[PDB]
Design a protein around this ligand. Structure first.
Ligand SMILES: [Zn+2]
Ligand SMILES: [Zn+2]
Ligand SMILES: [Zn+2]
Ligand SMILES: [Zn+2]
Lengths: 16, 110
């Protein structure tokens, strides 16, 4: 399943 | 309200990560936007998300109980519509995160 953990790893960090 | 810049690659709708045009999906609550390719959405998911009021990962509330809840770890996202659900708010409640694809109760047929 997709979670906040898996989603953030898949997208990577937000650009600063 | 919608921010015309992708939060991940900082491109507009004219320039995704491959420097090609791609429309942005925008969070209805905070305005943050992303290219579907940057969000890692498939076309099916992208079109369905373009069937509802969409929230980004940081604004997402449980579609059943209507709140974000206390723990970030127990929300899962539907592989068809990107809605978020608490494990406890699923039908039946989930004792454990499934592996692989999961589809929420709203998307499942009557
Ligand atoms: Zn992008
Ligand atoms: Zn948001
Ligand atoms: Zn809930
Ligand atoms: Zn769904």
């Amino acid at each position: 399943a997709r979670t906040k953990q898996t989603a953030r790893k898949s997208t990577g960090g937000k650009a600063p | 309200d919608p921010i015309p810049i992708c939060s991940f690659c900082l491109g507009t709708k004219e320039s995704n990560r491959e420097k090609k045009p791609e429309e942005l999906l925008s969070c209805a609550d905070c305005g943050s936007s992303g290219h579907p390719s940057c969000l890692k959405f498939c076309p099916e998911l992208t079109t369905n998300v373009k069937a509802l009021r969409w929230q980004c990962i940081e604004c997402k509330t449980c579609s059943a109980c209507r709140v974000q809840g206390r723990n970030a770890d127990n929300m899962l996202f539907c592989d068809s519509c990107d809605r978020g659900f608490h494990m406890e708010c699923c039908d039946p409640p989930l004792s454990r995160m499934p592996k692989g694809m999961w589809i929420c109760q709203v998307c499942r047929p009557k």
